[PDB]
Coordinates of C-alpha atoms and ligand atoms in Angstrom, one line a residue:
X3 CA 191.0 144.2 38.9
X4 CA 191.3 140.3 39.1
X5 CA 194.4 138.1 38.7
X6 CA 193.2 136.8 35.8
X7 CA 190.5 135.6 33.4
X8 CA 189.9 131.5 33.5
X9 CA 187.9 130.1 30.4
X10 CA 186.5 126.1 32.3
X11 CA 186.0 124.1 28.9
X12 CA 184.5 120.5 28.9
X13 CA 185.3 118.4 26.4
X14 CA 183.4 115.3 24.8
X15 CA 179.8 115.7 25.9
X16 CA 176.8 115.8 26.6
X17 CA 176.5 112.8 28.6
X18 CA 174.7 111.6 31.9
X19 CA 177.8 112.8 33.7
X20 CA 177.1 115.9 32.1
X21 CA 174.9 117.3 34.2
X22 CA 176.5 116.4 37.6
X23 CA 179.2 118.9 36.2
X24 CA 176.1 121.6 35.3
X25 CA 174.8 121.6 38.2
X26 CA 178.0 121.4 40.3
X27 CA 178.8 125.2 38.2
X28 CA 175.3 126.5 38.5
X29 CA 175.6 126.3 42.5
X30 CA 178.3 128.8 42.7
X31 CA 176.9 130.8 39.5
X32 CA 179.7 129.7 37.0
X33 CA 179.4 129.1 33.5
X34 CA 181.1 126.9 31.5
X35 CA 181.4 126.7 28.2
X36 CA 180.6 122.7 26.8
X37 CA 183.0 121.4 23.5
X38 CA 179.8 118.7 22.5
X39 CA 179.7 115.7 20.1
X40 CA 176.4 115.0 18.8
X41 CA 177.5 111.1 18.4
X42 CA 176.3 110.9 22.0
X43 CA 172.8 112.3 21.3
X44 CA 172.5 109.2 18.9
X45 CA 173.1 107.0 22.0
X46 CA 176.2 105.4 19.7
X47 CA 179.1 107.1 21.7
X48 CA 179.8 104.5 24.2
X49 CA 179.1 106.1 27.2
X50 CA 176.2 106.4 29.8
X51 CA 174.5 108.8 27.8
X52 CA 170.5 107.6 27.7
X53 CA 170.1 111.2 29.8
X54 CA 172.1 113.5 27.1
X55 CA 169.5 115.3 25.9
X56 CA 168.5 116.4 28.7
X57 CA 172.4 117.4 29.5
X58 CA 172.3 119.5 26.5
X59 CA 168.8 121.2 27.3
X60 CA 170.4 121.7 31.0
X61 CA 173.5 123.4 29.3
X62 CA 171.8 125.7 27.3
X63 CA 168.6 126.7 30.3
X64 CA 171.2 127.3 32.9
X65 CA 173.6 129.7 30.7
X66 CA 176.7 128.0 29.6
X67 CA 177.9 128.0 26.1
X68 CA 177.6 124.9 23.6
X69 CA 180.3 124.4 21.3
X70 CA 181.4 122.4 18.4
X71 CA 183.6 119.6 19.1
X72 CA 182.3 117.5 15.5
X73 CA 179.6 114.5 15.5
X74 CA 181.5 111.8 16.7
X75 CA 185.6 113.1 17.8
X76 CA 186.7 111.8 14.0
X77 CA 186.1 108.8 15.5
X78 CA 185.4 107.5 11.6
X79 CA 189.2 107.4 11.0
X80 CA 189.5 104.8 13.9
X81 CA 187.6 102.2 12.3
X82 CA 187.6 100.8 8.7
X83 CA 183.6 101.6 8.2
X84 CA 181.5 104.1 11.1
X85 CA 178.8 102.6 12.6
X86 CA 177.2 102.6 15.8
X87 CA 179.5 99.8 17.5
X88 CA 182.8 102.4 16.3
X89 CA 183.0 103.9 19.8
X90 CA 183.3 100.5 21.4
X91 CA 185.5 99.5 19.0
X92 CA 188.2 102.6 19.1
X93 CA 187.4 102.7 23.1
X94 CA 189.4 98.7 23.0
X95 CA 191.9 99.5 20.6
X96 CA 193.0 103.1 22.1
X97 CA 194.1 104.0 18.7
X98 CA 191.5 107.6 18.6
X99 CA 195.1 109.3 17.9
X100 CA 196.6 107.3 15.0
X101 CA 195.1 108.6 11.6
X102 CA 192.5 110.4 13.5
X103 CA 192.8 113.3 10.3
X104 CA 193.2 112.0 7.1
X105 CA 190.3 113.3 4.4
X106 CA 190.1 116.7 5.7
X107 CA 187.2 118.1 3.5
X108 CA 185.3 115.1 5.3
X109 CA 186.4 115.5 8.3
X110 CA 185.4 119.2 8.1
X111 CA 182.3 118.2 7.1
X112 CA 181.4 116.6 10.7
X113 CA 181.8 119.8 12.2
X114 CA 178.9 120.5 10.2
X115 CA 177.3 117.2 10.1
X116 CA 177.5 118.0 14.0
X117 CA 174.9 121.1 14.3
X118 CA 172.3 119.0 12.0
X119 CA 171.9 116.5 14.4
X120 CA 171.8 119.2 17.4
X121 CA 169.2 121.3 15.4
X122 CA 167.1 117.8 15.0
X123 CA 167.1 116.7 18.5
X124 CA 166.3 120.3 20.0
X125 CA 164.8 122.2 17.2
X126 CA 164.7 125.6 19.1
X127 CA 168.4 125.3 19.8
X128 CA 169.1 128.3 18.0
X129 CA 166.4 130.5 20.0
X130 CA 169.2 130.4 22.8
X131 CA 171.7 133.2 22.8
X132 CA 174.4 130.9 24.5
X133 CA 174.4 128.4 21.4
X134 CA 177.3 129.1 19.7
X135 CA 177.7 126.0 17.8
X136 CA 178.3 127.7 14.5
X137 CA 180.9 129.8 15.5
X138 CA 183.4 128.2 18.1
X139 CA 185.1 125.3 17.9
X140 CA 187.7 122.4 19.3
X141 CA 189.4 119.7 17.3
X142 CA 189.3 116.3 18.6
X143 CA 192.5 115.7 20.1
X144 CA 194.5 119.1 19.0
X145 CA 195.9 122.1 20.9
X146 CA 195.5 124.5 17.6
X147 CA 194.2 127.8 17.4
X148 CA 192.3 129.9 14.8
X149 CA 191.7 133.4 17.0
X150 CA 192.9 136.8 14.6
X151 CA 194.2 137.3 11.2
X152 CA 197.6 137.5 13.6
X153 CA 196.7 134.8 16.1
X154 CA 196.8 131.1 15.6
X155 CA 198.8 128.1 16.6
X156 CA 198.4 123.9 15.1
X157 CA 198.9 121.3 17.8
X158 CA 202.1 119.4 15.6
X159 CA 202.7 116.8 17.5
X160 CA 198.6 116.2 18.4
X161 CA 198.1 113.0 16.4
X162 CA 200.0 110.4 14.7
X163 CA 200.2 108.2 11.6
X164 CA 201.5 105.2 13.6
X165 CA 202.8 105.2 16.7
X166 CA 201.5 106.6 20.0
X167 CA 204.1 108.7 21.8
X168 CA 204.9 106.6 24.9
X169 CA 206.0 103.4 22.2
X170 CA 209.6 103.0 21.0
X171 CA 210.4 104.6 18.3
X172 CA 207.9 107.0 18.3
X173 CA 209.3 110.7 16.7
X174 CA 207.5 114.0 16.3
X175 CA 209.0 116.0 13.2
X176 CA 208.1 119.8 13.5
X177 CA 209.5 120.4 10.0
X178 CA 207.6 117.1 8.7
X179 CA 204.7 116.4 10.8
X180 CA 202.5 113.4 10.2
X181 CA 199.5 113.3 7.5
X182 CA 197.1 113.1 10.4
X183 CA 198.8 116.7 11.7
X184 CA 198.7 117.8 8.1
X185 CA 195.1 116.8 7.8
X186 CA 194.2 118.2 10.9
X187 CA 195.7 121.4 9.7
X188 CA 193.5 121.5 6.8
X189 CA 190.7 121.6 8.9
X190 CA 191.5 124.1 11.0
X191 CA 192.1 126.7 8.1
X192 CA 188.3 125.1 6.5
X193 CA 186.8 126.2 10.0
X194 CA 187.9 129.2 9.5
X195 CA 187.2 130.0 6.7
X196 CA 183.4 129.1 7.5
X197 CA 183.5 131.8 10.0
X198 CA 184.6 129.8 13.5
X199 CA 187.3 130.5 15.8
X200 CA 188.8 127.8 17.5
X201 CA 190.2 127.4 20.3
X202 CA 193.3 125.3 22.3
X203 CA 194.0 125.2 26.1
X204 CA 197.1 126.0 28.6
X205 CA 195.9 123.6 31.6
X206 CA 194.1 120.2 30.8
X207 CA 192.4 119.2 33.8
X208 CA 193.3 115.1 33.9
X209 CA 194.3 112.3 35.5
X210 CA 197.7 112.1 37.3
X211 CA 197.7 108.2 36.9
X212 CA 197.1 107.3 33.1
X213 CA 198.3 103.7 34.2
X214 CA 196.0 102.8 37.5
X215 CA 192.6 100.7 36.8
X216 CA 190.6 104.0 37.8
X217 CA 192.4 106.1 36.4
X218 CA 189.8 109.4 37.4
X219 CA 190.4 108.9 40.8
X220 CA 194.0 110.3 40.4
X221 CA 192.4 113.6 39.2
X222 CA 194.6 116.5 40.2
X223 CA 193.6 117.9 43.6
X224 CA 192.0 121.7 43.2
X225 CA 194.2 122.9 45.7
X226 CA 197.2 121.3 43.3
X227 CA 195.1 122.4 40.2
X228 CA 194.5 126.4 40.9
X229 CA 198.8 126.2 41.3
X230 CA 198.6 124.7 37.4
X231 CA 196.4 127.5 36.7
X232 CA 198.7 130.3 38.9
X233 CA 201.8 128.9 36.7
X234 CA 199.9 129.1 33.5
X235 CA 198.8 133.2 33.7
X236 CA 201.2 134.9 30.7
X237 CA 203.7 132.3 30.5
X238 CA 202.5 130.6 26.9
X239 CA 201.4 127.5 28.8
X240 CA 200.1 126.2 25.1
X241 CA 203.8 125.5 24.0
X242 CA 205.0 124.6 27.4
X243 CA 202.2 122.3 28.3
X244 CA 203.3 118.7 28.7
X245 CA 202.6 115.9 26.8
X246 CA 204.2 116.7 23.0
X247 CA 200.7 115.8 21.4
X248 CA 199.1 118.7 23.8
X249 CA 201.7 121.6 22.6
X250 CA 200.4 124.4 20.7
X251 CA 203.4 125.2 18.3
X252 CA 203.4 128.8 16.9
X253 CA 201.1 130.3 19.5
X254 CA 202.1 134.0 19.9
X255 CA 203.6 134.1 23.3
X256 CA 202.7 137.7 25.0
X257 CA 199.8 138.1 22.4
X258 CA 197.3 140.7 24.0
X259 CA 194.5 138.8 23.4
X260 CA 195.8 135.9 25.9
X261 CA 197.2 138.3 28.3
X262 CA 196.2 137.5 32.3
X263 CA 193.8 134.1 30.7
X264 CA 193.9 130.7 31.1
X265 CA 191.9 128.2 29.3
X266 CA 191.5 124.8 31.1
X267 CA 190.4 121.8 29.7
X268 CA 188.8 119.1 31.1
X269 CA 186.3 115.9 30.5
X270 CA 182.7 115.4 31.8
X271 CA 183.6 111.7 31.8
X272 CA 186.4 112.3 34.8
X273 CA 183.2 113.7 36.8
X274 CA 180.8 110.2 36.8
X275 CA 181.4 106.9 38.8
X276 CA 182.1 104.0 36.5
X277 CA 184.7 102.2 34.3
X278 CA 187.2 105.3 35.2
X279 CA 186.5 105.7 38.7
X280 CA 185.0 107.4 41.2
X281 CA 184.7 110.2 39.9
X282 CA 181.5 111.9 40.6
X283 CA 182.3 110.9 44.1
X284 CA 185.5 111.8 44.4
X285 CA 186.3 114.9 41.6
X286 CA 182.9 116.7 41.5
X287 CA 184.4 117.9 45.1
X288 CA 187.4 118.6 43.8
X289 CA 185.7 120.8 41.0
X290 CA 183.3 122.7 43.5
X291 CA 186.6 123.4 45.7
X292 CA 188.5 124.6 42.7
X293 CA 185.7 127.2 42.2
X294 CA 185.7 128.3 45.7
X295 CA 189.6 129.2 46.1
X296 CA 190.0 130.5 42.4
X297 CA 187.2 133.3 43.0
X298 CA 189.2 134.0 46.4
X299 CA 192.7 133.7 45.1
X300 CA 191.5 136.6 42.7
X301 CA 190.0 134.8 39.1
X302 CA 187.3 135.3 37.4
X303 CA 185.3 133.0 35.5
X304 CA 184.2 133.5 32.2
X305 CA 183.0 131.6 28.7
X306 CA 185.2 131.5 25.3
X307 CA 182.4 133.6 23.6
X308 CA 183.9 136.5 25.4
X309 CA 187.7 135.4 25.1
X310 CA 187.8 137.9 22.6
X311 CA 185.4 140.9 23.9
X312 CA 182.2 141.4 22.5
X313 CA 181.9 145.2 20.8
X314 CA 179.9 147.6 22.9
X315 CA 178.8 150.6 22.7
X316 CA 180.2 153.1 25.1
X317 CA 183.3 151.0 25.7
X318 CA 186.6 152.7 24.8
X319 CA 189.5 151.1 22.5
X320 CA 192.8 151.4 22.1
X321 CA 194.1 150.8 18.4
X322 CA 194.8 147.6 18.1
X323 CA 192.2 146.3 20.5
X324 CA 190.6 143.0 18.9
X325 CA 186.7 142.4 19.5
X326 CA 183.7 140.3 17.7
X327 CA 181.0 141.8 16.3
X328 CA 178.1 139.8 15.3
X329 CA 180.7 136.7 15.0
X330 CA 183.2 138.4 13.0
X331 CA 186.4 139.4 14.7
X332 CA 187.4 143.2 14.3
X333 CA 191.0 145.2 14.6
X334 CA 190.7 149.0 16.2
X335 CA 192.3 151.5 13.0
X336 CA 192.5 154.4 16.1
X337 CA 191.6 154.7 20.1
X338 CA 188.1 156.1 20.4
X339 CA 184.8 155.3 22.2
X340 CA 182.3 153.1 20.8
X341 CA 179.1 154.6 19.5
X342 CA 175.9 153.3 18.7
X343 CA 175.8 154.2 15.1
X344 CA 179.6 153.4 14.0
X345 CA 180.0 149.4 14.5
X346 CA 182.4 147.2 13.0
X347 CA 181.5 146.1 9.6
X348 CA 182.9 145.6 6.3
X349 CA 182.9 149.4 5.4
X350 CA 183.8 150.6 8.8
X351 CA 186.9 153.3 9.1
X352 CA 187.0 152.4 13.0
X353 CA 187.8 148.9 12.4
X354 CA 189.5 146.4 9.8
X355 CA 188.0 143.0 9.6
X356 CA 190.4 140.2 11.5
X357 CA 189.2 137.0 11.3
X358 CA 191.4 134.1 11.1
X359 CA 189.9 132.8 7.9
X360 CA 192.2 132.6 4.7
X361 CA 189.5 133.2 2.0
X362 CA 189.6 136.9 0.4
X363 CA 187.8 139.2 2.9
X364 CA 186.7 143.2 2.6
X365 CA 187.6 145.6 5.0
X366 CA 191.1 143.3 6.0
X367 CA 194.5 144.8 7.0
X368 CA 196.3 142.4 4.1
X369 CA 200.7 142.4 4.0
X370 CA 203.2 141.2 2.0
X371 CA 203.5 137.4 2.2
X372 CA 199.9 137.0 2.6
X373 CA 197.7 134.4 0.3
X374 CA 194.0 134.8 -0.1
X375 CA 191.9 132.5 -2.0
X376 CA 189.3 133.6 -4.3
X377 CA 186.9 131.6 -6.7
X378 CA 188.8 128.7 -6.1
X379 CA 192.3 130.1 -6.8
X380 CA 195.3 131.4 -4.6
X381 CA 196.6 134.7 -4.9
X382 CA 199.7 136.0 -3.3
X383 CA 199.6 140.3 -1.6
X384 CA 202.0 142.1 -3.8
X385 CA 201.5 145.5 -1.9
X386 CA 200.0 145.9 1.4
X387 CA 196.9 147.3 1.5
X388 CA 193.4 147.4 3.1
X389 CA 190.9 145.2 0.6
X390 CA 187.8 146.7 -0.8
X391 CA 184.9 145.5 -3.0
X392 CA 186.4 147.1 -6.1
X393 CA 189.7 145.4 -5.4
X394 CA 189.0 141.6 -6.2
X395 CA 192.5 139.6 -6.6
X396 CA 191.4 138.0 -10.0
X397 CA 191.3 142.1 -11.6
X398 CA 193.2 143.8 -9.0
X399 CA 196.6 143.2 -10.9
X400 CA 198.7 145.6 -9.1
X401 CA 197.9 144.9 -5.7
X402 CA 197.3 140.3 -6.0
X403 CA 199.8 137.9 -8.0
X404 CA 198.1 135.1 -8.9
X405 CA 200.1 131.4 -7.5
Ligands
NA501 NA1 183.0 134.1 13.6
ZN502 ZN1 187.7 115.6 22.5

């Protein structure tokens, strides 16, 4: 059995570098899975990017997962009005972290905004089983989580209503974090709630020299890297992870679910010689090595589609055992083997529904202290119980208190 599972995530694509990155994967059969902002299809997100449909089509032919990363990296809270100059413009100022949440029904709402503009420039994108850009998900900028019912964390220190964490005076309150936090929050719980999980990292792939004029050039080593990785399997790297805007804060250390993984993130753009560096030249090596002398140390590589397993038939689980079925996450009631005729669903006595949404649900394991909303309003589980279609919290008097 392998040491462990690693998830290779790439954030902020597709761009030209893109595809130096695909191919580099596709060589030693690897698949990635590709956190992508439409912004760049639009040829408005300040990078080489002329080439980035093709990038996506390459993605998507060659096997790797597309995910949702939002149109433009809320890159409209930057500037005072969005535009096609606003990458340019956040690019000089360096200010992508301050306010970067602040309407978070609108921010949301580039999430979806996102998968229009995919499903315009490649109309058959959903033909391709690896598309999952309606059901996983990164925030720009935020270590936060939105996995099981029992199994989410918010990046609180990720962004900032002000100051950015290396300038004096700069303070991260975990009992009153900043608007953009708050905001950022939000948006988690509305992605959610539309059925997406989303998903953080332990290891973030990056330059060792934020302060040099090429900054990708000090890209750690994979030799160095793989020991990042090693340190990272079941010790909770998400809240030990350094810098304070990359913590994960309330990630369930020793959750099952994350047991013997490690999700890395990393960026195309370190990958492509230009304003950053060399780094096509000098990383893309780096990355190839990296995938050599994981395999041998003992990983596996693997997509965040299958972070939690996928139900199938003839498998056996444990109670307790989480899996996705059809996009819907799913909580074992006993141990047995999976058959053909008895899936998951919202009726099923094998399994109670475990999504990480917030909105009333059927079939869900609900507990005392829980809050479900409802047409519009907030109820509050008076008695634990397993909801039904019978059991609505706006009638079901006994079991809902309305807040
Ligand atoms: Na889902
Ligand atoms: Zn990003």
């Amino acid at each position: 059995a392998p040491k462990g599972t690693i998830y290779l995530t790439f954030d902020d694509g597709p761009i030209n570098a893109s595809i130096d990155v695909i191919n580099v994967l596709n060589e030693q059969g690897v698949k990635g899975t590709f956190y992508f902002n439409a912004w760049h299809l639009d040829g408005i997100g300040d990078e080489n990017e002329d080439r980035a449909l093709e990038a996506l089509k390459l993605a998507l032919d060659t096997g790797h997962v597309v995910a949702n990363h939002s149109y433009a990296h809320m890159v409209h809270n930057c500037v005072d009005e969005f535009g096609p100059t606003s990458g340019a413009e956040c690019n000089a100022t360096g200010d992508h972290q301050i306010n970067a949440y602040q309407d978070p029904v609108y921010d949301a709402s580039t999430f979806a905004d996102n998968l229009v503009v995919f499903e315009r420039y490649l109309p058959n994108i959903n033909s391709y089983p690896n598309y999952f850009g309606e059901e996983l998900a990164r925030l720009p900028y935020t270590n936060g989580w939105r996995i099981t019912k029992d199994f989410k964390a918010d990046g609180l220190c990720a962004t900032s209503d002000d100051l950015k964490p290396w300038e004096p005076g700069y303070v991260c309150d975990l009992d009153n974090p900043s608007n953009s936090v708050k905001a950022s929050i939000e948006v988690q719980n509305i992605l959610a709630n539309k059925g997406y999980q989303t998903h953080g990292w332990d290891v973030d792939w990056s330059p060792e020299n934020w302060g040099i004029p090429m900054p990708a050039n000090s890209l750690t080593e994979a030799e160095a890297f793989l020991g990042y990785v090693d340190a990272a399997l079941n010790s909770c790297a998400p809240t030990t992870i350094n810098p304070i805007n990359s913590k994960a804060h309330g990630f369930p250390c020793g959750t099952p679910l994350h047991a013997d993984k490690v999700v890395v993130l990393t960026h195309e753009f370190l990958y492509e010689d230009g304003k950053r560096g060399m780094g096509a030249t000098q990383n893309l090596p780096k990355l190839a090595k990296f995938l050599r002398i994981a395999k041998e140390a003992g990983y596996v590589f693997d997509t965040i589609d299958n972070y939690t397993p996928v139900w199938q038939v003839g498998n056996a689980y444990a109670a307790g055992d989480y899996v996705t079925h059809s996009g819907t996450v799913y909580k074992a009631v006993t141990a047995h083997i999976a058959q053909q005729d008895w899936a998951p669903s919202s009726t099923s006595s094998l399994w109670t529904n475990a999504d990480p949404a917030t909105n009333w649900t059927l079939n869900v394991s609900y507990e005392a202290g829980d809050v479900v909303t409802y047409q519009g309003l907030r109820y509050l589980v008076n008695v634990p119980h397993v909801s039904q279609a019978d059991w609505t919290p706006n009638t079901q008097n006994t079991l809902f208190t309305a807040l």
